[PDB]
Amino acid sequence: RARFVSKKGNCNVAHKNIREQGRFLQDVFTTLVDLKWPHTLLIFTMSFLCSWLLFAMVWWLIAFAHGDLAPGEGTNVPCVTSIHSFSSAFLFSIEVQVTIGFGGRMVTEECPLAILILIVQNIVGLMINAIMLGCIFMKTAQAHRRAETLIFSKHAVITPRHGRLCFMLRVGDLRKSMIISATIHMQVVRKTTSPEGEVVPLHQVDIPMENGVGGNSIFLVAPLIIYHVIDSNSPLYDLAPSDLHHHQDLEIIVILEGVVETTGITTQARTSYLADEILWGQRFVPIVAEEDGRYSVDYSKFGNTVKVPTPLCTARQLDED
Amino acid sequence: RARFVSKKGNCNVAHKNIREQGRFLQDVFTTLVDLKWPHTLLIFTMSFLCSWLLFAMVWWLIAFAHGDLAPGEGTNVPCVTSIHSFSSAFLFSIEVQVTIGFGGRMVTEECPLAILILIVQNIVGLMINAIMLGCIFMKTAQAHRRAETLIFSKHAVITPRHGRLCFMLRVGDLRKSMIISATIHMQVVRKTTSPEGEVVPLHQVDIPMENGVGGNSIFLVAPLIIYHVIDSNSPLYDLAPSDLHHHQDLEIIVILEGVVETTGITTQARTSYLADEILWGQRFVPIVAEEDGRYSVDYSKFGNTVKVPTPLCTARQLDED
Amino acid sequence: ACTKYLSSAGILLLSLLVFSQLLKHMVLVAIDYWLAKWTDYAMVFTLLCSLGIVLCLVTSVTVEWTGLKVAKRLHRSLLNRIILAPMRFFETTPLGSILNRFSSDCNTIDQHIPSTLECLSRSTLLCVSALTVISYVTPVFLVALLPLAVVCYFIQKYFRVASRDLQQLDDTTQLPLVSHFAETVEGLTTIRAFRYEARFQQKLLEYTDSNNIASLFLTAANRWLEVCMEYIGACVVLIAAATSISNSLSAGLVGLGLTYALMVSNYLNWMVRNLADMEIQLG
Amino acid sequence: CGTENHSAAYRVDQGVLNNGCFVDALNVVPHVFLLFITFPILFIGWGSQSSKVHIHHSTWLHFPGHNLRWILTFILLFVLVCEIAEGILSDGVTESRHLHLYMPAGMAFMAAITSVVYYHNIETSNFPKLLIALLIYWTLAFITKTIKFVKFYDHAIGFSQLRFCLTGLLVILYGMLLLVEVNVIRVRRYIFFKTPREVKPPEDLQDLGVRFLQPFVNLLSKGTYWWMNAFIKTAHKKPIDLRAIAKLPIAMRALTNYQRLCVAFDAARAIWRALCHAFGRRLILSSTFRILADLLGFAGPLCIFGIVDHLGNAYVLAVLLFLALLLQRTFLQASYYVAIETGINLRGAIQTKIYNKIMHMSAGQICNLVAIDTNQLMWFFFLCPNLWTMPVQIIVGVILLYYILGVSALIGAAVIILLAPVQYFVATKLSQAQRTTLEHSNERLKQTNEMLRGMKLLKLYAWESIFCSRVEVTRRKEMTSLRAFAVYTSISIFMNTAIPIAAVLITFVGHVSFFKESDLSPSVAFASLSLFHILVTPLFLLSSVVRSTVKALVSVQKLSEFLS
Ligand SMILES: COc1ccc(Cl)cc1C(=O)NCCc1ccc(S(=O)(=O)NC(=O)NC2CCCCC2)cc1
Ligand SMILES: Nc1ncnc2c1ncn2[C@@H]1O[C@H](COP(=O)(O)OP(=O)(O)OP(=O)(O)O)[C@@H](O)[C@H]1O
Ligand SMILES: Nc1ncnc2c1ncn2[C@@H]1O[C@H](COP(=O)(O)OP(=O)(O)OP(=O)(O)O)[C@@H](O)[C@H]1O
């Protein structure tokens, strides 16, 4: 009785024997963006800290090689001014990569090497900031947060409309902003067997949206009733009004794609309906009311369904008679 | 026996007599992003180095024109303080573009020209950083790395399903993250001749996905079996069960498009199947198993196919009888 | 409830046993204590010889006498209680459920329970003595001792669960092998002329493998618990040595502490293993 | 680095001037660089294991020649801890602190653990474009300690220059382990055109789900059973079923072990030789680990002796004792876990062989043969390592006991010589009473079966009392046998408790009363005591080993009979 995907999508599938070739880590940036915020912050905190520290040791050493640190004498000229301890060297490293340049610690012309190190450190730190920014930008574009604003009624009903038995489901959007080119796809997950004896554990069947023009798009502003009319080509043509719910173990996958009008990022709203989450002989209660100046949506009535007289047979039997 | 595209896509086609108009280089930024990381780094290392250096020479010269460098006398006032050698001038250049400003080297009001040079150098260096960042961002968006995470079975089989002879192929995704609006296109590359005597060296034929709603989209979470039912309109209607594999030299092109849920970047997964990579009379072994709490995918069984009794004739002959 | 064994034992021999065990263990502690007060001539050495005579067999003889008492009492009691019961309780229940108890449980009680309870109690009082002496030498050792005791508690619980499961599963696993084996001998010519022996090769392979993976896990489990129990013993060796030398900076207290710090690694293993075994065998 | 202004007076004096404190800062470099370059990489892996690790339980491979990598890391950590001790001893002048004379080493220790967890993560998921940093780090650290060692030889005093010897030791350590990964380069050759490397048998072994995946893990697990940890939490959570339990790995087959046994046969002088030729290679490793565990056990009271010597060089002995105990325990477990595996595979292959002999017959005795003697083999094999090991522990304990105590070592030697054949004798009379108890138990249980099956007919006649009196008769005969058991068990536990008392008592007293030139320091006494705590186990295990080898001769004799 395992679900393919949860009520909130979040597909629950294990993947055994991945022959990892290391491609998992090669894709460093999709991974970084995929990370939770606390880890993105730790990595960049660590990267900066390490970069500042790794270079700082080099600066301290160059001071040491020159031997300028303990003489503290005027005649000798240091490569990096005001360098008395590692700590002084560390602070110098910080001032270089984050471009502070306090000035109490300056680079002289004594060490042609110090000049080279300065060039390298600036560039390395520079590239790090470039990469870090790129990563942060993509994270701020994680539109999946908008996917959480999309609503799917907990249960979908089966009722006749225009004399035809159909599958109904309510969907909505809580934000004022729109989702452009909102497209809905519906698949039926069913362990199926062909006549050739072939067995499929999770066969996915495409379900038409009864769109008037055969399209999959929908202008969703107010909660809408998405439905599928069951016909000779629908896998639900043989649904039993009583056993389909509990003894059969099927799952309806509802996918809502589209782009956020604000970012341009394509997202997905995923949900599922097990056999026991579907109601037979019930329909949805109207949600939209009307004020003198506008239309109003009552979201507390989303899961509100009522029992209506309905034929208690399979769609096939209904058509046969 | 040359392949159009490799098993891993990477289309292998030479392009002779390009009448290059220079548009190849005009598109500097698509090119920069296209470059491998080591070269992107070298270019920007070089660009900074050059920019820092080119300007540094100018700074040294302005010191020279003023003649402030060798007098080292107090009465005279330098345009740029602490300038004794080119090296001192170089370090000054660095401190300006990467905005360090150590302070040991400052710009005075003596040279109205030095002031102008400072303005120019800041802006030039500023624009460079802007362009450099832009380039780095697009590189961090190179979602082709996700294309490498997509799997295509090495060989595709030909077996009957529901009594109809069909072409089967397994496809998967190794990452937890999804690919939105995943669309599959299938083309047949065949040197073909019309009745008018016209000859085409690489004619591409469109192949339907047997989608229940006539769509090309697929919600791929678990490995799926993509197939094409051979009919009167399919170019495989006359396939010979034995000679189609070796004496005929056809190629099946499989394209998997879609956008990465994390970046919003559209990518492609490209693969091909030569005649000898197709099996006749074999099907795929089930991959998905089931644990008490979830569904499990065994990826080590991807290329696992078994022999099943099948008609040994062309799809046409099968239909004729 | 393990106390039913105690009620079948009688309180008097319990008192004899526990008082004699505490007697000989505190005698061992006192031997090492006056050894320390020695080493930091006739007097305390004659005291040590007089101490070392005191340790005696009485706990062992008390254990064995008590086991004989429990055996004859439970045997007579279950015999008379079952022959009191009507024929209907024999008819509803399987006779194998009675006779398997009669054979296995009596052989368990009369062969393995008494000695293993004695060694479990002995190892228990030995680790108590070791911790007591190490705490007596190094008083601030207890701060380090506490979370290690917590970790030993957690490991202890997890091991006991996994060990009961694997042990019972191994004991059930080995039996259809010898069952199939005896069958395969009894119908040998039948299978040969049937020419089905490849099938029963395969079945014996399945049974044999099963007995292996069952045994392997049991062995692996035992090793895992044993390995962890020693790491903690090595840690308390380190901490006791550091604290003792830090405070010393007398000799005898430190040397006793290190001796018992050595012994505690074997003590933990012995106690846990015997605990899980007795938790099985009191069923 | 120092007290006065000398840290600079290095470079104030001209040229290189051999750079005394400076080479320590050069050795800082490799270690600090390593941590920093790899922190970003290691961290993403750590975050990925927190995010999505269901894929991580699917993929496993070993780089070629990696066991020696593990053990070289272990012993270099050992010597690093030793040079940390040398650095603290050198700073023990304490006129001022000398950070650069022990901290560099400490950073190496930190670096070493990272340098091996990084290797564990590249071995976790194959990405050979990632140990480039690793090998350049090893060659750079090798170069820096090489410079340190040659300047040490430039300022040499020679043999007792302790840091010199230790330094060159870990120099050639890094050099040889550096050669290890270029052997890995020679294998995989990823910088030139190819790497076709993949394991099927652990990967296809993984197909059934739950695993006894020990044969393929890191050597850390192979000492500590790290893999087991994950498995037990489930058993605490949910109950355990046979389906949940694993299926043995590719090499672990009754078929495969039987096949190698058949190869051994194809190759007194027959079956025994085949068994050795089939399992000797596997067995001798357990023996070796057991021998090393013996040496590390004898290191214990030596450390006690030195500690109570200096308390009459202290924490260093404790730390070395700590490492010795860890490796000892681990070595003992390794020997234990290999003895077992050999036993098991022997049981499966021998059962298969017996079965095929039955299949070639062109019966309760045969069931007894399998159900007894194969189990005896399994057990004997576990205690097979001890056949020559027991002589070592006892003898080397005697040698150190003499080097501590002088003439009184023969007292405790007399105690243990009086110990062992007493155990043998009591085991003999135990087995006699076992056979008596088996006879009485068979009588009682068979009569009990007849009574329980006819218990209805006894209920018809109220004839239960007569046959319960029969039960009582056979039960009293059983109680006679059980009193014999009580006798023999009490005498065994009295031996195993009272022997360590008498040994210590008579040894110290005969020492001191034998000559008034005795000197009963705690360093003598307690080291001898802990030796006596060691040497109970070998004797008490050796008596059972002797009886086991008698039973072993019997098992081979009966199998020789049946395989005829
Ligand atoms: C543990 O005493 C000793 C003391 C000292 C010496 Cl030098 C050797 C031993 C010793 O024992 N050497 C045999 C090696 C050994 C025996 C038992 C155990 S164990 O922890 O009881 N685990 C199991 O027996 N598993 C069973 C074994 C039989 C098949 C089915 C699984 C672990 C290892
Ligand atoms: N070989 C080539 N490589 C790249 N671009 C080309 C090439 N040949 C033509 N083009 C550009 O693309 C167009 C292709 O059209 P076509 O080849 O018919 O040109 P055309 O009719 O020969 O006229 P033209 O002489 O301008 O090419 C041309 O107008 C030209 O601008
Ligand atoms: N278990 C797996 N996990 C990840 N990637 C895989 C896995 N198995 C195969 N691949 C990659 O994807 C492709 C899947 O094809 P398939 O499983 O048919 O491979 P194959 O025919 O067994 O050949 P190969 O032995 O190269 O896998 C393989 O070519 C392989 O490169």
Coordinates of all heavy atoms in Angstrom, one line a residue, chain D residues 124-177:
Chain D
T124 N 34.0 6.1 -1.9 CA 32.6 5.9 -1.7 C 31.9 6.0 -3.1 O 31.1 5.2 -3.5 CB 32.0 6.9 -0.8 OG1 32.7 6.8 0.5 CG2 30.5 6.8 -0.6
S125 N 32.2 7.1 -3.8 CA 31.7 7.3 -5.2 C 32.9 7.6 -6.1 O 33.7 8.5 -5.8 CB 30.7 8.4 -5.3 OG 30.2 8.5 -6.6
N126 N 33.1 6.8 -7.2 CA 34.3 6.9 -8.0 C 34.3 8.2 -8.7 O 33.5 8.5 -9.6 CB 34.3 5.8 -9.0 CG 34.6 4.5 -8.3 OD1 35.2 4.4 -7.3 ND2 34.1 3.4 -8.9
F127 N 35.3 9.0 -8.5 CA 35.6 10.2 -9.2 C 37.1 10.4 -9.2 O 37.6 11.2 -8.4 CB 34.9 11.4 -8.7 CG 35.0 12.6 -9.5 CD1 34.5 12.7 -10.8 CD2 35.7 13.7 -9.1 CE1 34.6 13.8 -11.6 CE2 35.8 14.9 -9.8 CZ 35.3 14.9 -11.1
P128 N 37.8 9.7 -10.1 CA 39.3 9.8 -10.0 C 39.9 11.1 -10.5 O 41.1 11.3 -10.4 CB 39.7 8.6 -11.0 CG 38.6 8.5 -11.9 CD 37.3 8.8 -11.2
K129 N 39.1 12.1 -10.9 CA 39.6 13.4 -11.1 C 39.7 14.2 -9.8 O 39.8 15.4 -9.9 CB 38.7 14.2 -12.1 CG 38.7 13.7 -13.5 CD 37.7 14.7 -14.3 CE 37.7 14.3 -15.8 NZ 36.8 15.2 -16.6
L130 N 39.8 13.5 -8.7 CA 39.8 14.2 -7.4 C 40.9 13.9 -6.5 O 41.2 14.6 -5.5 CB 38.4 13.8 -6.7 CG 37.9 14.5 -5.4 CD1 36.4 14.7 -5.6 CD2 38.1 13.5 -4.3
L131 N 41.6 12.8 -6.7 CA 42.8 12.5 -5.9 C 44.1 13.1 -6.5 O 45.2 12.8 -6.0 CB 43.0 11.0 -5.7 CG 43.5 10.1 -6.9 CD1 44.1 8.9 -6.4 CD2 42.3 9.7 -7.8
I132 N 43.9 14.0 -7.4 CA 45.1 14.8 -7.9 C 45.7 15.6 -6.8 O 46.9 15.6 -6.6 CB 44.7 15.6 -9.2 CG1 44.5 14.7 -10.4 CG2 45.7 16.7 -9.5 CD1 43.2 14.2 -10.7
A133 N 44.8 16.3 -6.1 CA 45.2 17.1 -5.0 C 45.8 16.2 -3.9 O 46.8 16.5 -3.3 CB 44.0 17.8 -4.4
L134 N 45.3 15.0 -3.8 CA 45.8 14.0 -2.8 C 47.3 13.7 -3.1 O 48.1 13.8 -2.2 CB 44.9 12.8 -2.7 CG 45.2 11.7 -1.7 CD1 43.9 11.2 -1.1 CD2 45.9 10.6 -2.4
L135 N 47.6 13.3 -4.3 CA 49.0 12.9 -4.5 C 49.9 14.1 -4.6 O 51.1 13.9 -4.2 CB 49.1 12.1 -5.8 CG 48.9 12.6 -7.2 CD1 50.0 13.5 -7.6 CD2 48.8 11.5 -8.1
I136 N 49.4 15.3 -5.0 CA 50.4 16.4 -4.9 C 50.6 16.8 -3.5 O 51.7 17.3 -3.1 CB 49.9 17.6 -5.8 CG1 48.6 18.2 -5.4 CG2 49.9 17.1 -7.3 CD1 48.7 19.4 -4.6
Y137 N 49.6 16.5 -2.6 CA 49.8 16.8 -1.2 C 50.8 15.8 -0.6 O 51.5 16.2 0.2 CB 48.4 16.7 -0.5 CG 48.7 16.4 1.0 CD1 48.8 17.4 1.9 CD2 48.7 15.1 1.4 CE1 49.1 17.2 3.2 CE2 48.9 14.8 2.8 CZ 49.1 15.9 3.7 OH 49.3 15.6 5.0
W138 N 50.7 14.6 -1.1 CA 51.7 13.6 -0.5 C 53.1 13.9 -0.9 O 54.0 13.8 -0.1 CB 51.3 12.2 -0.8 CG 50.1 11.7 -0.1 CD1 48.9 11.3 -0.6 CD2 49.9 11.6 1.3 NE1 48.0 11.0 0.3 CE2 48.6 11.1 1.6 CE3 50.7 11.9 2.4 CZ2 48.1 10.9 2.8 CZ3 50.2 11.6 3.7 CH2 48.9 11.2 3.9
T139 N 53.3 14.2 -2.2 CA 54.6 14.5 -2.6 C 55.1 15.8 -2.1 O 56.3 15.9 -1.8 CB 54.7 14.5 -4.2 OG1 56.1 14.6 -4.5 CG2 54.0 15.6 -4.8
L140 N 54.2 16.8 -1.8 CA 54.7 18.0 -1.2 C 55.1 17.9 0.2 O 56.1 18.4 0.7 CB 53.7 19.1 -1.4 CG 54.2 20.6 -1.4 CD1 53.3 21.4 -2.4 CD2 54.2 21.2 0.0
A141 N 54.3 17.1 1.0 CA 54.7 16.8 2.4 C 55.9 16.0 2.4 O 56.7 16.1 3.4 CB 53.5 16.1 3.0
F142 N 56.1 15.1 1.5 CA 57.3 14.3 1.4 C 58.5 15.2 1.2 O 59.6 15.0 1.8 CB 57.2 13.2 0.3 CG 58.4 12.4 0.1 CD1 58.7 11.4 1.1 CD2 59.3 12.6 -1.0 CE1 59.9 10.7 0.9 CE2 60.4 11.8 -1.1 CZ 60.7 10.9 -0.2
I143 N 58.4 16.1 0.3 CA 59.5 17.1 0.0 C 59.8 17.9 1.2 O 61.0 18.1 1.6 CB 59.2 17.9 -1.2 CG1 59.2 17.1 -2.5 CG2 60.1 19.1 -1.4 CD1 60.5 16.5 -2.8
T144 N 58.8 18.4 2.0 CA 59.1 19.2 3.1 C 59.7 18.5 4.3 O 60.7 18.9 4.8 CB 57.8 19.9 3.6 OG1 56.8 18.8 3.9 CG2 57.2 20.8 2.5
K145 N 59.2 17.3 4.6 CA 59.9 16.5 5.6 C 61.3 16.0 5.1 O 62.1 15.8 6.0 CB 59.1 15.3 6.0 CG 57.9 15.6 6.9 CD 57.4 14.3 7.4 CE 56.9 13.5 6.3 NZ 56.2 12.2 6.7
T146 N 61.5 15.8 3.8 CA 62.8 15.5 3.3 C 63.8 16.6 3.6 O 64.9 16.4 4.0 CB 62.7 15.2 1.8 OG1 61.7 14.2 1.6 CG2 64.0 14.8 1.2
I147 N 63.3 17.9 3.4 CA 64.2 19.0 3.7 C 64.5 19.1 5.2 O 65.6 19.3 5.6 CB 63.5 20.3 3.2 CG1 63.4 20.3 1.6 CG2 64.3 21.5 3.6 CD1 64.8 20.2 0.9
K148 N 63.5 18.8 6.0 CA 63.6 18.8 7.4 C 64.6 17.7 7.8 O 65.5 18.0 8.7 CB 62.3 18.5 8.1 CG 62.3 18.5 9.6 CD 60.9 18.2 10.1 CE 60.8 18.3 11.6 NZ 59.4 18.0 12.1
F149 N 64.6 16.6 7.2 CA 65.5 15.5 7.6 C 66.9 15.7 7.1 O 67.8 15.4 7.8 CB 64.9 14.2 7.0 CG 65.7 13.0 7.4 CD1 65.7 12.5 8.7 CD2 66.5 12.3 6.5 CE1 66.4 11.4 9.1 CE2 67.3 11.2 6.8 CZ 67.2 10.7 8.1
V150 N 67.1 16.3 5.9 CA 68.4 16.5 5.5 C 69.1 17.7 6.2 O 70.3 17.6 6.5 CB 68.5 16.7 4.0 CG1 68.0 15.5 3.2 CG2 67.8 17.9 3.5
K151 N 68.3 18.6 6.7 CA 68.9 19.7 7.5 C 69.2 19.1 8.9 O 70.1 19.5 9.6 CB 68.0 20.9 7.6 CG 67.9 21.6 6.3 CD 69.2 22.2 5.8 CE 69.0 22.9 4.5 NZ 70.3 23.5 3.9
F152 N 68.4 18.2 9.4 CA 68.7 17.4 10.6 C 70.0 16.7 10.5 O 70.8 16.6 11.4 CB 67.6 16.4 10.9 CG 66.4 17.1 11.6 CD1 65.2 16.4 11.7 CD2 66.5 18.4 12.1 CE1 64.1 17.0 12.3 CE2 65.4 18.9 12.7 CZ 64.2 18.2 12.8
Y153 N 70.2 16.1 9.3 CA 71.5 15.4 9.1 C 72.6 16.4 8.9 O 73.8 16.1 9.3 CB 71.4 14.5 7.9 CG 72.7 13.7 7.6 CD1 73.1 12.7 8.4 CD2 73.4 14.0 6.5 CE1 74.2 12.0 8.1 CE2 74.6 13.3 6.2 CZ 75.0 12.3 7.0 OH 76.1 11.6 6.7
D154 N 72.3 17.6 8.5 CA 73.3 18.7 8.4 C 73.7 19.1 9.8 O 74.8 19.5 10.0 CB 72.8 19.9 7.6 CG 72.7 19.6 6.2 OD1 73.5 18.8 5.7 OD2 71.7 20.1 5.5
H155 N 72.8 19.0 10.8 CA 73.1 19.3 12.2 C 73.0 18.1 13.0 O 72.5 18.1 14.1 CB 72.2 20.4 12.7 CG 72.3 21.7 11.9 ND1 73.4 22.6 12.1 CD2 71.5 22.3 11.0 CE1 73.2 23.6 11.3 NE2 72.1 23.5 10.6
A156 N 73.5 17.0 12.5 CA 73.3 15.7 13.1 C 74.2 15.5 14.4 O 75.3 16.0 14.5 CB 73.6 14.6 12.1
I157 N 73.6 14.7 15.3 CA 74.4 14.0 16.3 C 74.4 12.5 16.2 O 75.3 11.8 16.6 CB 74.1 14.5 17.7 CG1 72.6 14.2 18.0 CG2 74.3 16.0 17.9 CD1 72.2 14.4 19.5
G158 N 73.3 11.9 15.5 CA 73.3 10.6 15.1 C 72.2 9.7 15.7 O 71.1 9.9 15.3
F159 N 72.6 8.7 16.5 CA 71.7 7.6 16.9 C 70.6 8.1 17.8 O 69.4 8.0 17.5 CB 72.5 6.5 17.5 CG 71.7 5.3 17.9 CD1 71.2 4.4 17.0 CD2 71.5 5.0 19.3 CE1 70.5 3.3 17.3 CE2 70.7 3.9 19.6 CZ 70.2 3.1 18.7
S160 N 71.0 8.6 19.0 CA 70.1 9.0 20.0 C 69.4 10.4 19.7 O 68.7 10.9 20.6 CB 70.8 9.1 21.4 OG 71.3 7.8 21.8
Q161 N 69.7 10.9 18.5 CA 68.9 12.1 18.1 C 67.5 11.5 17.7 O 67.3 10.9 16.6 CB 69.6 12.7 16.8 CG 69.2 14.1 16.5 CD 70.0 14.7 15.4 OE1 70.9 14.0 14.8 NE2 69.8 15.9 15.0
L162 N 66.6 11.6 18.7 CA 65.3 10.9 18.6 C 64.4 11.4 17.5 O 63.9 10.6 16.7 CB 64.6 10.9 19.9 CG 63.3 10.2 20.0 CD1 63.4 8.8 19.8 CD2 62.7 10.5 21.4
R163 N 64.3 12.7 17.4 CA 63.5 13.3 16.3 C 64.0 13.0 14.9 O 63.2 12.9 14.0 CB 63.4 14.8 16.6 CG 62.4 15.5 15.8 CD 62.4 17.0 16.2 NE 62.0 17.2 17.6 CZ 62.8 17.5 18.6 NH1 64.0 17.8 18.4 NH2 62.3 17.7 19.8
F164 N 65.3 12.9 14.8 CA 66.0 12.5 13.6 C 65.5 11.2 13.1 O 65.0 11.0 11.9 CB 67.5 12.5 13.8 CG 68.3 12.1 12.6 CD1 68.5 13.1 11.6 CD2 68.8 10.9 12.5 CE1 69.3 12.7 10.5 CE2 69.6 10.5 11.4 CZ 69.8 11.5 10.4
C165 N 65.5 10.1 13.9 CA 65.1 8.8 13.6 C 63.6 8.7 13.3 O 63.2 8.2 12.3 CB 65.5 7.8 14.7 SG 67.3 7.7 15.1
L166 N 62.8 9.4 14.2 CA 61.4 9.4 14.0 C 61.0 10.1 12.7 O 60.1 9.7 11.9 CB 60.7 10.1 15.2 CG 60.8 9.2 16.4 CD1 60.3 10.0 17.6 CD2 60.1 7.9 16.3
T167 N 61.7 11.2 12.4 CA 61.5 12.0 11.2 C 61.7 11.2 9.9 O 60.9 11.2 9.1 CB 62.3 13.3 11.3 OG1 62.0 14.0 12.4 CG2 62.1 14.1 10.0
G168 N 62.9 10.6 9.8 CA 63.2 9.8 8.7 C 62.3 8.6 8.5 O 61.9 8.2 7.4
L169 N 61.8 8.1 9.6 CA 60.8 7.0 9.6 C 59.5 7.5 8.9 O 59.0 6.9 7.9 CB 60.5 6.5 11.0 CG 59.5 5.4 11.3 CD1 60.0 4.6 12.4 CD2 58.1 5.9 11.6
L170 N 59.0 8.7 9.3 CA 57.8 9.1 8.6 C 58.0 9.7 7.2 O 57.1 9.7 6.4 CB 56.9 10.0 9.5 CG 57.1 11.5 9.8 CD1 55.7 12.0 10.0 CD2 57.9 11.7 11.0
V171 N 59.3 10.0 6.9 CA 59.6 10.4 5.6 C 59.5 9.2 4.6 O 58.8 9.3 3.6 CB 61.1 10.9 5.5 CG1 61.6 11.0 4.1 CG2 61.2 12.3 6.1
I172 N 60.1 8.1 5.0 CA 59.9 7.0 4.1 C 58.5 6.4 4.1 O 58.1 5.8 3.1 CB 61.0 5.9 4.4 CG1 61.0 5.4 5.8 CG2 62.4 6.5 4.1 CD1 60.2 4.1 6.0
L173 N 57.8 6.6 5.2 CA 56.4 6.4 5.2 C 55.6 7.1 4.1 O 54.9 6.5 3.4 CB 55.8 6.7 6.6 CG 55.5 5.5 7.5 CD1 54.4 4.8 6.8 CD2 56.7 4.6 7.6
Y174 N 55.8 8.4 4.1 CA 55.0 9.2 3.1 C 55.5 8.8 1.7 O 54.7 8.8 0.8 CB 55.1 10.7 3.2 CG 54.4 11.3 4.3 CD1 53.7 10.6 5.3 CD2 54.1 12.7 4.3 CE1 53.0 11.2 6.3 CE2 53.4 13.3 5.3 CZ 52.8 12.5 6.3 OH 52.1 13.1 7.3
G175 N 56.8 8.5 1.5 CA 57.3 8.1 0.2 C 56.7 6.8 -0.3 O 56.2 6.8 -1.5
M176 N 56.6 5.8 0.6 CA 56.0 4.6 0.1 C 54.5 4.7 -0.1 O 53.9 4.1 -1.1 CB 56.4 3.5 1.1 CG 56.0 2.1 0.7 SD 54.5 1.5 1.3 CE 55.0 1.1 3.0
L177 N 53.8 5.4 0.8 CA 52.4 5.6 0.5 C 52.1 6.5 -0.6 O 51.1 6.4 -1.3 CB 51.7 6.1 1.8 CG 51.8 7.5 2.4 CD1 50.7 8.3 1.8 CD2 51.8 7.5 3.9

